[PDB]
Amino acid sequence: EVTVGKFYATFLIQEYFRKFKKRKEQ
Amino acid sequence: ADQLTEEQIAEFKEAFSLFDKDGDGTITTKELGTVMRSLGQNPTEAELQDMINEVDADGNGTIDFPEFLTMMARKMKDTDSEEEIREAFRVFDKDGSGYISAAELRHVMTNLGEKLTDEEVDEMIREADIDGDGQVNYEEFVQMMTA
Ligand SMILES: [Ca+2]
Ligand SMILES: [Ca+2]
Ligand SMILES: [Ca+2]
Ligand code: NA
Ligand code: NA
């Protein structure tokens, strides 16, 4: 539970970076 | 209904490689510690080993990418968009205050988004901190993560 959540939160933040770069461009 | 594209696997590999900083295909306790420490945490060796143990399916003491992918794809399949944001906020809200300081979130972002520039992280924080009080509260985080 807790361990999985820590790894998955990293991915979710990296996903946010990807979307932010897309919105900044288009 | 929960297939993985090539791009999705590459995105999970980017998350894997955040921890596998030497690129040998395994995450060790030391590598996990390097990340957690960079976020200002101080896990013990036993705490690091227990974390590795939850994902290490074959018990050889490290996490490889098939183990990581198994855990990450299962988490994704089992958790909805609103739930995963909620849980991620609580990961970064270390003291359970309902806030992440702007300075803390900037440091988190610089360390988890290794190729981000300072200008980009600044823009992300300015967008996240809607009211500009220097704190990113829960609903501010939800709205930054859903945009
Ligand atoms: Ca490694
Ligand atoms: Ca293993
Ligand atoms: Ca705020
Ligand atoms: Na907090
Ligand atoms: Na960077």
Give residues with Cβ within 8 angstroms of B114, minimum separation 6: B18
The answer to whether the beta carbons of residues B106 and B125 sit under 8 Å apart is yes
For residues B69, A17, B38, B59, the Cα torsion angle rounded to the nearest 10 degrees is 0
The token duo for B60 is 């050889």
Residue B25 C-alpha to ligand 1 middle, in angstroms? 6
What is the rounded distance in angstroms from the CA atom of residue B29 to the CA atom of residue B53? 10
Resolution (A): 1.6
The token duo for B79 is 């958790």
User: Reduced to 3 states, what is the DSSP secondary structure of residue B100?
Assistant: strand
Residue B127: closest C-alpha in chain A: A20
Determine whether the interchain pair B91/A6 forms a contact, defined as Cβ–Cβ distance below 8 Å.
yes
Q: Where do the DSSP E strands lie in chain B? A: 26-27, 63-64, 99-101, 135-137
The total of other beta-carbon atoms located within 10 Å of residue B42's CB is 8
The ligand minimizing its distance to the Cα of B111 is 5
Which parts of chain A fold into alpha helices (H)?
2-25
Residue B81: closest C-alpha in chain A: A12
